[PDB]
Symmetry: D2
Subunit: 272 residues, 4 copies
């Protein structure tokens, strides 16, 4: 893996390189962090991407690196997942450029550490809007604009925070638990349109804004990482492999599932 | 086996036999959002029948006034009716100040306020989804958060969140409510962990299909097909609001001194067998 | 927190929060009722008008319990020797109970076995013995109860379980696995037996003072008190607290509750180290 | 549009790689129940990815017939062994013989199980305990022997085949639901203890799968099954190849960061299937 939002210098295939040949994946948050590596790894298996987030310069920069490293197409778009007309405009544009969308990865999210007693009403609601309503919004627009009529696959990038009520995280754990339930609800309603919907819940991942923001001090982090079952942080590529699995015809019979890829961290990490 | 008595409407029970001691919550005060109708009305009544005063808070001032008169009249306890939207933190803050000025303490918070309706996820508008999130999830947070600041942080207290089982199986026509209620269940865990040291217990209670409630009216669907699924459910009957109020009273009371961070399902096993 | 005593002795006083007649003239059959949690459960039931049958392997253990329980409460306590793994002995014990009281209203599956052991060092027979006592044994007394009385008259079952299996607690593969099976069993029996008017729920305790489980598995005093003070309610639970939640589930106040797992652990599984 | 399958315990007559065919190159997988149903298809698919297999169950005819077909179809080695997961000394012999023959074991798939429909009231103690013994004690016995004999010192991957039965307490299945739920917990326990020796442990819980003894015994009548399958999210039964794909994913370097997890691969079936 690479720490920054840059592409791998080399890659060995474990899935066939034509696994998503000529498919198109729409990736919210695909300009940094996990969403960046997911876009890269999809493109190394023949997939074209659309990457969409608020920051136009961020997606433009990412798109040039992704296309450069892989030779597939990456369409960068500016859109806030909370603004349905912008989501609609983005999906219209993707359809016009590529003609099809096969996979939606809902990776956009926001998080920060804060005691629940100190978190403002707006702060709590901002996270629910971005993670939960934003995931609903983008799924809801895809369904309507393409997936209802053509089938499709969704992966929701979630978390394990809500499992044990991770301190300082009431906002993110609540929103992410909402998205996991949302995964089952959509899996039930939309499966008969040939749409699969699963969640993938990463553990602590090196080279991501999430870890830089939420990981805490270095010394306290190593101790919890060393006491976790695989004894290390996960990396962006490993997460992208799991997401790629779930988005691919190799998960043809998998829907309504939450796959945890955390190295067993949620089983042992401290809380309180 | 006979359930305890209930009445279909938002009226008090004409008789009641105690199974908890009548002084279980002697002179305590409970703040109940949505205490003017349905489950929250019956919760308020049963609490007041165990010695508790209540504050009942929801949007509609006529609704809580009508409710408050009935509740005091049937129980000899004090009920303060307050108009307050759980989504509007200045309104929640003013309602909590008024309650504390009236009573000088609040011991229990019941988050019962919510919104729901049947709608396919493919026809649900963005505003519709978000509105449910706002009332169930953000409103429960806002009221808990304001209670924390104004009293519980310094004095302890007990929260009971009224949730649902909708999200366990992804119940059709219900993505909004099931998502909202699953967030609240996580919030229960989160607050129990952070607020435990302040002597605050937080739990969820998740009801099954309940007779005499607007949620059954709106969500239960056609009578004949509702009967089929109830009869096929393990206790073969709808729950009633008084049964749900007993489970809430259990969690809100010193009988649950060691219960925090837990979700108690009171649904007669419905989620295990209902169709999806 | 309501008072408790460390030993298998009755409370010297007790404040009622349920009505004293909550279980008037019911009969509860309680496996493991001669020590620890089950003994306090028998006591608290009997202080609510209920008679008890307490059954475990050691007749000495249940004889001395029954004497203490009947003396403290003025209700009846029948002590029986019975291994939950042994259908003929389980059948005999339930026949005796019915001969004695003419009814059983409530079953509490509290009998269990446990100890700390790393998975790689645990023998095949040690793993299977825990499975046998906790899971097959609970099934055994439950089905025997069904066939002899609950099928035709209704009843209530509470299974005492654990949170060990949620995060896969180290040194506890056997007990975590066994208790997660009983929680599934709770849902299965609730479904099949609900239409005969039988409710089935699980109660999963946290770390409880005054118990063999805490003595055996709590570990050194100083690492125990560190995790305890780092847990949400910052204390151990006590046996009276668990009995109160068990009594709740066993009682008509939980008329609409079945197939549920109620966790009573002061939030300890959310925060305890693994 | 699923990958192809054959109904009987025969190899696929054609195949298209979606994983690289060297994904498990020169590894050895020990598979209990590897001579029929889902375990047969796991062995084949692993063999098509460069893996040698050892298949172990009670019936020698079964695993003899299987190992010939598997070697024939793939060009890899398949060591068949009579072995009862319930007998530790036979488990120890079989693992010793696998290690003698191959020099290594990389992967363990615990697929051996037993099941049948029976109401709890008609299920005897011995019947319940039998299913607990094969499914739970057996999966423990095999993992424990592998651990000591090889995985402790060399690392490894275990996949336990489980089920969703215990989620909603599926009728007529108290035995299998209980045993499988115990296995999903053991997955978590083993991952926590054995992770630091470089061993991953995950569960894979299949839905109703065509071409299996489990479907034949449990699926019930055709008409009633079709109805429930047609009303499930993907509107079809899973097949053995799809399950093999998921199991291979978990057993492979693509799942390097996955441990203590349960992957449900059931086409959403547990969400909607009736629990009559
Ligand atoms: C383990 C990780 C898994 C979980 C998910 C992730 O990791 S995501 C990985 C980490 N990456 C990110 O979060 C990247 C994207 N994040 C963001 O954009 C931000 O952090 C954000 C979510 C607040 C930004 O959104 P917006 O611009 O919409 O909102 P804005 O900054 O106006 O803030 C809205 C409210 O949140 C409050 N707020 C913002 N930061 C806060 C903080 N650190 N602690 C407390 N409260 C805070 C603000 O004060 C304000 O409340 P008031 O109005 O009361 O002042
Ligand atoms: C097991 C069963 C569990 C049941 C438990 C429960 O959850 S609660 C028990 C049920 N009782 C209830 O009171 C349900 C709550 N009552 C309500 O409907 C609530 O008052 C509410 C959720 C709509 C909130 O009302 P508001 O006045 O804030 O909102 P408003 O009426 O402006 O509607 C907000 C958005 O929702 C959409 N909307 C409203 N009703 C809708 C419906 N039946 N089907 C589809 N969409 C609907 C609206 O058109 C609007 O979207 P646009 O902007 O697109 O027009
Ligand atoms: C936080 C939640 C925790 C809750 C706590 C609980 O669940 S209840 C916990 C507290 N209470 C109790 O356990 C009291 C009852 N316990 C018991 O009776 C026993 O300890 C028991 C569980 C083993 C059951 O006794 P049995 O007579 O049936 O079994 P027996 O004595 O033959 O032992 C069976 C196998 O287990 C192994 N064994 C026994 N104790 C062991 C130990 N401390 N460490 C490792 N292995 C052990 C034996 O060596 C033997 O294996 P070999 O044949 O291979 O030699
Ligand atoms: C939707 C999700 C689905 C989930 C999927 C799954 O897990 S199912 C996938 C697995 N499917 C299978 O292939 C099952 C194949 N396995 C089998 O060998 C058998 O059914 C078995 C486990 C019982 C066989 O083992 P044994 O030969 O050791 O057992 P044996 O016949 O001696 O029986 C042991 C005890 O069980 C009782 N028993 C056995 N079969 C029974 C039945 N159909 N109904 C009632 N009781 C039965 C016996 O009478 C005896 O108890 P008494 O001593 O009282 O007489
Ligand atoms: N890192 C971890 O250890 C970890 C652990 C568990 C879960 N996760 C999850 O993994 C995902 C990515 O995490 P990360 O650590 O990789 O953080 P990251 O790089 O900050 O990714 C979050 C992305 O969200 C986009 N985004 C935020 N708000 C948005 C909005 N309103 N509309 C559209 N786009 C928005 C951001 O781009 P803009 O700023 O340009 O909008 C950014 O690319 C998140 O879903 C997170 O919850 C991460
Ligand atoms: N009935 C069931 O079968 C069932 C099943 C599972 C869960 N539940 C849960 O049970 C609780 C009670 O539901 P119920 O069926 O009895 O329905 P209900 O009578 O309609 O109660 C909901 C209450 O919420 C109040 N409310 C709605 N929005 C609000 C807001 N923004 N601010 C403040 N108050 C608000 C309403 O009063 P105003 O209109 O006056 O504001 C109302 O009194 C809910 O949490 C519900 O999700 C019910
Ligand atoms: N203490 C805690 O912190 C804690 C935490 C979570 C769960 N629990 C659960 O609470 C319950 C009681 O635990 P405890 O700590 O109070 O331990 P305890 O006093 O040792 O109780 C266990 C009882 O089970 C009986 N028993 C054991 N094997 C038996 C068999 N084969 N047949 C019949 N009876 C059998 C024992 O009596 P005989 O020796 O006379 O048979 C003993 O009375 C158990 O289910 C335990 O798993 C306790
Ligand atoms: N088929 C489904 O729809 C479905 C659904 C959920 C889960 N599953 C699970 O998938 C796995 C395979 O099931 P299947 O439906 O494919 O049925 P299956 O072909 O009968 O497979 C079960 C295998 O277990 C072996 N076995 C049984 N007891 C054993 C013992 N004591 N020791 C060693 N081996 C033993 C059997 O062989 P011997 O008789 O030769 O020992 C048989 O090969 C099972 O774990 C089952 O629980 C299946």
């Amino acid at each position: 893996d690479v720490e920054g939002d840059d592409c791998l210098p080399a890659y060995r295939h474990l899935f066939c390189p034509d696994l998503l040949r000529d498919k198109v994946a729409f990736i919210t948050g695909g300009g940094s962090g996990i969403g960046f590596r997911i876009a890269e790894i999809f493109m190394r298996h023949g997939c074209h991407t659309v990457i969409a987030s608020r920051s136009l310069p961020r997606v433009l920069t990412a798109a040039r690196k992704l296309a450069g490293a892989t030779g597939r197409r990456c369409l960068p778009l500016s859109m806030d997942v909370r603004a349905p007309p912008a989501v609609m405009a983005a999906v219209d544009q993707a359809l016009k450029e590529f003609g099809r969308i096969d996979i939606l990865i809902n990776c956009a999210a926001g998080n920060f550490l804060c005691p629940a007693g100190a978190l403002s009403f707006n702060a709590f609601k901002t996270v629910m809007d971005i993670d939960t309503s934003g995931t609903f919004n983008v799924s809801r627009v895809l369904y309507e604009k393409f997936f209802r009529d053509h089938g499709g696959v969704i992966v929701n990038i979630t978390a394990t925070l809500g499992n044990r009520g991770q301190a300082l995280q009431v906002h993110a754990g609540s929103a992410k638990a909402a998205v996991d339930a949302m995964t089952r609800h959509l899996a039930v309603e939309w499966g008969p349109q040939n749409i699969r919907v699963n969640s993938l819940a990463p553990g602590p991942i090196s080279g991501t804004e999430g870890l830089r923001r939420l990981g805490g001090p270095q010394a306290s982090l190593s101790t919890k990482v060393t006491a976790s079952p695989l004894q290390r942080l996960g990396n962006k590529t490993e997460i992208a492999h799991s997401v790629l699995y779930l988005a691919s015809p190799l998960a043809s019979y998998v829907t309504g599932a939450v796959l945890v890829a955390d190295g067993g961290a949620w089983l042992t990490f401290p809380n309180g």
